[PDB]
Structure 1
Amino acid sequence: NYHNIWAKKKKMELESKGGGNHPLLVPYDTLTAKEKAKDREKAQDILK
């Protein structure tokens, strides 16, 4: 969900830029484990 938040910000950036499809605009599930770790750390720390 917070990846969706980030992707909404980056999508607004995409329309403002007029182009430049970002490689990580794919869904959070589609993202790699390494990229998902940036949000996983916050998930783990807040819940724990």
Structure 2
Amino acid sequence: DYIPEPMDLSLVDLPESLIQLSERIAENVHEVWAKARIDEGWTYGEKRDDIHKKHPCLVPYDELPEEEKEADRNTAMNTIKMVKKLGFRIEKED
């Protein structure tokens, strides 16, 4: 029986200017991931198949369902919130 105990991020505040770019960050995070898989012989498939190297998320980011892009933008902001929580400043450059 699995019960996740994440560290709480709900009070971590990021620059609005950073949240505004979360779509661009998720797309590129997706693209970097897809390049690596395709460079190692993965191809599009209906379900995740490690033994044959097939994955359904190997399509352009823009063609993903919006619920997935939503998950991906959340993960991108959760990552940076965890950075700030581990004690790093995040500031827009002048």
> With structure 1 as the length reference, what TM-score do the two structures score?
0.56
In structure 1, the partner of 2:8 is none
Distance 2:37 2:70 in 1: 18
* Identity score, percent: 43
After the TM superposition, list the runs of 4 or more consecutive aligned residues in structure 1 that deviate by more than 4 angstroms: none
Structure 1: which 5+ runs fail to align?
none
Aligned pair count reads 45
Distance 1:28 1:8 in 2: 12
The equivalences for 1:24-43 within 5 A come to 24-43=57-76
Counterpart amino acid of residue 14 in structure 1 = W
The CA RMSD over aligned residues, in Å, is: 2.9
> With structure 2 as the length reference, what TM-score do the two structures score?
0.35
Q: Which has the higher helix share?
A: 1
Distance 2:32 2:71 in 1: 14
Q: Which has the higher strand share?
A: 2
Distance 2:33 2:53 in 1: 16
In structure 2, the partner of 1:8 is 35
